[PDB]
Design a protein around this ligand. Structure first.
Ligand SMILES: *[C@@H]1O[C@@](F)(CO)[C@@H](O)[C@H](O)[C@H]1O
Length: 1025
């Protein structure tokens, strides 16, 4: 039954950060006083008296829960509901079952937060490193035990004569609105603390000409949006004139109400903590922005258009911002389901780390069946171009082009080898996906939840069963709004419009996700694609991203590009490029709880789509998958918690230097919002040349794009292609189309391929421990200079996740950059060339190099001392896809020069996702290695933490800076032997002809290679004298 809490919904339209202003006080309640309401488990209740700040005699009472969530990881939670009872969400990143599991574990270890009400009514409690006090009006001080330092405090506002009111807890009188807010003191301007705020999902922020990482001193909003180019005109500030650049006040595709605050950076007294307002209505994060009077320099807040109020403060276990990220990912963890592998996120197939190509505007599988049309291309041509030119190349992102007339889950004849649709498994009529398997590729295909509704009487089973089973969103509201209607019906359906431009368009119905039965119906449609050879999913238009529309207009008519605007507001008539926000949706937050207008829950839609694809598509129907039983999702939208469904790409970027800068910042920020497998379209998706949209990306920009993206988790070149029947886009963008740059393009893809295990093992570090793959420079501790370098330096890889430094050039036509090397370690220049020549001399960390040289053919990438990295090569020397590697393609442990006479490395091994036995049954291995120099003796030790996956071929150790040994001894469960010099005199010969127990003195790269049998991998001691 609709609106069960009896809310009066006051706001439906978007409200920019210019119109959200808690610090203006008027009509806001804040916390005035309280009394104790008891403690159950680790949850204290305070009965709080809220007073109206501009009239403190107007008062209301609500219960406020304060809960310790983790003692060891120093986290706690504050929640209340000004609109009804406090309720646990049944879907979302934070679930009570996980909180319960964490509390049960810590209790069994004797953790005691000692939560107590003092006799004065104040609440006090401790965690491992912290001590908290909450006074009568909710004024809060969080103190660090070791030094006494106050690391966080909430904000109070004075009144004329009625006492101080605490702005830590705020909500708008329900006579006037529905918003909520929470305000902290912000020490950004403090000379010593110099607080900086980080995180926030996909927000872009310009400073002068450059896009930057930090999110200090700015007003932001989470409001999932079809935001092509990151600067959609309807998102402009009131009365904005001239061009709109992407910038901090524009919402993006991923909803991330999450910041990590970092102060006293680089000193022994650094502190960090993360702040999450777990709300799925439009939310706001202001880190001290005066613009529009939205906030105040010395305060920070989070808020949202709708309740309930639920926020988490996360300080982490160890020192540094990375520890904040690992603790956040624990709160969202699946330890409560006893995951043997997928604890903090879900492991992809190895092939997800390959190089992919998407094209929007292919018109067939084969050249033989391609319809004639200016600039038409076949999938076949694309594969040829990469394969004939020896690119490492994983396969394809196959767009809505392959579908029958935009009906999702269909294909058309042109995308089969015999030019007609079959049901799969016919060797004389292969699907695009079957044909791609025979080329050694895998594919994703674009799926959205628009179910085409205008079918001209033709049969489309997906839409028909959605109808028949009453599973679509209805056209109901509390406002009597008329969302529109077509001749197709049904008469009570919400009907939207999908618009790809250039006439590529249709009417659609949508699944009402919170209804029981919907998630299962949806997952089952994927059988129709899995059984014809599809490997993984590309999840698009997820807001869901509807054609812009105004109430009263026909379903297929959009308003003037300029509307709405300040002089002519939406006034409850614009759809804000998704559902008209008054539509009653079955509640996605709370099961079996009724319907609410979509305005209350916008930012949960993408998350729920992905969830349903993951559980009911990929997992439930895993039997219908052909070549790889493990699969994955790469989604355009979502909410905090998406890492448990798959990874992300940052939608529709463009082809300029600024988009490279944004790609890098987005990747780092998304990693710290616990979404690690993320990327942006390499080369930019949209056209960029205003005098002729068809102009391709320049050679030099593509090189820089590829260089910047090559060690980022998701690596796909994808673009809008101009073709006769879809006349927007660029002519081409494929790497093989760049003859002058081909050699460079190719060698950075090879470089990535060699480090496939670095990426895959970082991914395991994330699934298991929650460590971000990509590290912000400021995650590197005891360094006072990283913060300056942080826009375009990042780190990754190796046993701790900090063994590789990247500082890619972020400007076209530029052959130098300012380089900063983190201090108290030594660095070695590396990159695609260094595989086949010696290292250069050590570079001293803490060095700043102005105008450091960077030819187009190079990019700045450094390997830290003490690193041992797993590295892969093809046995034959040809470039192949990841998914066609076997254990006979060499695994090689490269030992870089030692740090303090030591080096360390880790490697995760499984079958790559051929089966799901690694995550279902524990079938994986984790090998560690160490090297120690002690006088004239070097010892290299291999150990395992589990060895449940048997690596099937020989493996190597490549020691850099070593030459001829006097003797090498290997000890291992399988007894022990001395090694002998190989008869092989080259690397290809050692790989193919060399015997197990052979070593090779590689003078050309100044390396010693040792070849070892597979049985000594899990446990060995190697003594080099
Ligand atoms: C979804 O939309 C398309 F289908 C067409 O623009 C894709 O090619 C895009 O990458 C994605 O945003």
């Amino acid at each position: 039954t609709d609106n069960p809490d009896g809310i009066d919904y006051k706001t439906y339209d978007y409200v920019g950060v210019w119109g959200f202003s808690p610090l203006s006080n008027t009509n806001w309640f804040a916390a005035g006083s309280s009394t104790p309401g008891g403690i159950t488990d680790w949850t204290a209740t305070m009965n709080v008296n809220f007073d109206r700040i501009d009239n403190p005699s107007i008062t209301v009472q609500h219960p406020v829960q304060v809960q310790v969530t983790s003692y060891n990881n120093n986290s706690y939670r504050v929640r209340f509901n000004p609109d009804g009872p406090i309720r646990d969400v049944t879907r979302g990143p934070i679930l009570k079952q996980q909180l319960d599991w964490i509390r049960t574990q810590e209790l069994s270890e004797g953790c005691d937060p000692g939560m107590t009400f003092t006799s004065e009514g104040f609440l006090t409690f401790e965690t491992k490193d912290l001590s908290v006090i909450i006074y009568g009006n909710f004024k809060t001080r969080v103190t660090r035990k070791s030094d006494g330092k106050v690391i966080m405090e909430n904000d109070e506002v004075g009144t004329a004569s009625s006492g101080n009111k605490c702005r830590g807890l705020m909500f708008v009188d329900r006579l006037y609105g529905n918003a909520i807010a929470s305000v902290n003191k912000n020490f950004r301007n403090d000379a010593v603390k110099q607080e900086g705020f980080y995180g926030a999902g996909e927000v872009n922020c310009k400073y002068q000409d450059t896009y930057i990482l930090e999110r200090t001193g700015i007003a932001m909003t989470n409001y999932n949006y079809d935001n092509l180019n990151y600067n959609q005109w309807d998102l402009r500030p009131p009365h904005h004139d001239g061009a709109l650049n992407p910038d901090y006040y524009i919402p993006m595709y991923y909803a991330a109400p999450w910041l990590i605050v970092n102060g006293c950076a680089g000193t022994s007294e650094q502190y960090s903590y993360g702040w999450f307002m777990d709300n799925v209505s439009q939310s706001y994060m202001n880190t001290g922005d005066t613009t529009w009077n939205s906030g105040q320099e010395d305060l920070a807040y989070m808020g949202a258009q709708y309740g309930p109020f639920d926020q988490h403060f996360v300080y982490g276990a160890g020192g540094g911002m990375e520890c904040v990220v690992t603790a956040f990912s624990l709160l969202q963890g699946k330890e409560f389901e006893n995951q043997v592998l997928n604890k903090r996120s879900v492991m992809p197939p190895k092939y997800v780390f390959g190089f992919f190509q998407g094209v929007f505007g292919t018109s067939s599988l084969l050249r033989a069946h391609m319809p004639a049309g200016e600039n038409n291309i076949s999938v076949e041509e694309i594969v040829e171009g990469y394969q004939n030119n020896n690119f490492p190349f994983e396969g394809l992102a196959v767009d809505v082009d392959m579908q029958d007339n935009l009906r999702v889950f269909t294909t058309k004849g042109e995308f089969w080898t015999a030019n007609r649709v079959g049901t799969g498994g016919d060797p004389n009529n292969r699907s695009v996906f079957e044909w791609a398997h025979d080329k050694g590729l895998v594919c994703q295909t674009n799926i959205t939840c628009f179910l085409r509704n205008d079918n001209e009487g033709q049969d489309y089973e997906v839409n028909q069963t959605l109808r028949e089973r009453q599973l679509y969103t209805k056209n109901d509201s509390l406002t009597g709004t008329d969302f529109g209607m077509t001749d197709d019906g049904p008469s009570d359906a919400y009907i939207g419009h999908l618009d790809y431009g250039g006439g590529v368009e249709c009417d659609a119905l949508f699944p009402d996700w919170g209804r029981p039965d919907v998630a299962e119906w949806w997952g089952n449609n994927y059988k129709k694609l899995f059984s014809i050879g599809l490997d993984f999913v590309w999840q698009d238009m997820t807001v869901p991203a509807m054609m812009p529309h105004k109430i009263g207009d026909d379903i297929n008519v959009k308003p003037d590009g300029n509307w709405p605007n300040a002089d002519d507001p939406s006034n409850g008539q614009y759809n804000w490029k998704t559902y008209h926000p008054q539509v009653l949706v079955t509640d996605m937050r709370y099961e079996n709880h009724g319907r609410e207008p979509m305005v209350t829950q916008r930012n949960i839609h993408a998350y729920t789509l992905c969830e349903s694809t993951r559980k009911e598509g990929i997992v439930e129907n895993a039997d219908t998958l052909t070549k790889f039983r493990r699969s994955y999702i790469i989604s355009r939208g979502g909410y905090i918690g998406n890492q448990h469904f798959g990874g992300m790409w940052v939608g529709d970027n463009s082809t300029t230097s600024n988009y490279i800068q944004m790609m890098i910042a987005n990747n780092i920020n998304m990693n710290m919002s616990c979404l690690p497998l993320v990327g942006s379209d390499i080369g930019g998706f949209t056209s960029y040349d205003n005098e002729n949209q068809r102009t391709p990306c320049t050679g030099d920009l593509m090189v820089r794009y590829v260089q910047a993206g090559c060690l980022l988790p998701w690596f796909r070149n994808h673009y809008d292609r101009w073709i006769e029947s879809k006349d927007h886009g660029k002519d081409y963008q494929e790497l093989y189309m760049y003859p002058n740059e081909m050699d460079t393009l190719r060698k950075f893809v090879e470089f990535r391929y060699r480090w496939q295990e670095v990426l895959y093992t970082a991914m395991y570090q994330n699934a298991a421990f929650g460590k971000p793959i990509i590290k912000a420079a400021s995650m590197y501790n005891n360094d006072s200079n990283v913060r300056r370098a942080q826009n375009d330096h990042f780190l990754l890889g190796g046993h701790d996740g900090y063994r590789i430094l990247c500082a890619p050039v972020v400007w076209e036509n530029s052959t130098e950059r300012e380089l900063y090397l983190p201090v108290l370690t030594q660095w070695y220049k590396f990159g695609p060339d260094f595989d086949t020549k010696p290292l250069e001399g050590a570079m001293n960390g803490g060095d700043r190099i102005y105008n450091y040289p960077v030819p187009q053919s190079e990019s700045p990438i450094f390997v830290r001392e003490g690193a041992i990295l797993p590295t892969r090569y093809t046995l034959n020397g040809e470039n192949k896809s990841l998914n066609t590697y076997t254990d006979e393609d060499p695994l090689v442990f490269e030992v870089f020069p030692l740090g303090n006479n030591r080096a360390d490395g880790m490697c995760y091994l499984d079958d790559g996702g051929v089966t799901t036995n690694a995550e279902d049954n524990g079938k994986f291995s984790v090998v560690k290695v160490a090297a120690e120099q002690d006088g004239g003796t070097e010892t290299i030790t291999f150990t395992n933490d589990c060895y449940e996956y048997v690596f099937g071929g020989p493996f190597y150790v490549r020691v850099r800076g070593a030459q001829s040994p006097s003797n090498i001894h290997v000890s291992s469960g399988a007894g022990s032997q001395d090694m002998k010099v190989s008869s092989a005199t080259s690397r290809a010969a050692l790989f193919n002809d060399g015997e197990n127990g052979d070593f090779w003195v590689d003078q050309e790269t100044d390396s010693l290679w040792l070849k070892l049998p597979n049985v000594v991998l899990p446990d060995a001691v190697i003594t080099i004298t």
